[PDB]
Amino acid sequence: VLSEGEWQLVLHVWAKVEADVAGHGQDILIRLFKSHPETLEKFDRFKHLKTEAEMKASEDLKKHGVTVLTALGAILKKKGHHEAELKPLAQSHATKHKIPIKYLEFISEAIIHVLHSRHPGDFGADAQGAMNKALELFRKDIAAKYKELGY
Ligand code: HEM
């Protein structure tokens, strides 16, 4: 589990993200889609986007980026007790959207990359290690639910 100090580093940089949820959402999803094209194929809403410029110009993508980061924010703020927040997410992503745990690892990488780009001062090695731990916890718990339903 993460220590109180680790959660503090995670939430300190996350407070910086909340100042521009939409901007962060775009960078993260675009990074995910470009680095791992197979993830884009999972979104019927975004499959038509063929260039980074098109992705950046999509208000629909920006809207989803907010949805994603808002859900993640609520999870991170629950620190070591995010059971209630994960249930609906793990459920939909396993059976409805069919998102393998590996894709959650990909988006975690994208999140960490964008955080470093936008908040280097509050995202040094210690904060980076803490965020990695928080995102690993997120994936681990979702994975447990995935195994439960046989996905
Ligand atoms: C930080 C990790 C993620 C979070 C917090 C997150 C959160 C959400 C939320 C809140 C929704 C809308 C409600 C729902 O259906 O549950 C959603 C929908 C969806 N997510 Fe995620 N998601 C994450 C990662 C991913 C990844 C990695 C993929 C695909 C590779 C993905 C694919 C989808 C799809 C396809 C939908 C349905 C979109 C639609 O039809 O409008 N998500 N996600």
CB proximity list for 131: less than 8 A, separation 6 or greater: 9, 10, 13, 111, 112, 115, 123
Work out which ligand 1 atom sits closest to the CA atom of 69. Answer: 5
- Distance (Å, whole) CA 31 – CA 28: 5
| Cα 12 from Cα 53, distance rounded (Å) | 31
- CATH assignment at residue 18: 1.10.490.10
142 lines ligand 1 (CB under 6 A): no
| CB of 43 sitting under 6 A from ligand 1 | yes
Phi-psi region of 100 (alpha: psi -120 to 50; beta: other; left: phi over 0): beta
Ligand 1 atom 15 nearest Cα: 92
How many domains in the chain?
Answer: 1
SS3 of 90, please?
A: helix
User: Reported resolution in A?
Assistant: 1.7
Handedness of CA 92, 97, 98, 99 (dihedral sign): negative
Q: Do residues 77 and 11 touch, judged by C-beta distance below 8 A?
A: yes
Q: Which residue has the tokens 């949805």?
A: 67
Which are the contacts of 117, defined by CB distance < 8 A and separation ≥ 6?
27
Largest Cα–Cα distance of the chain, in whole Å? 43
Range of the domain at 30: 1-151
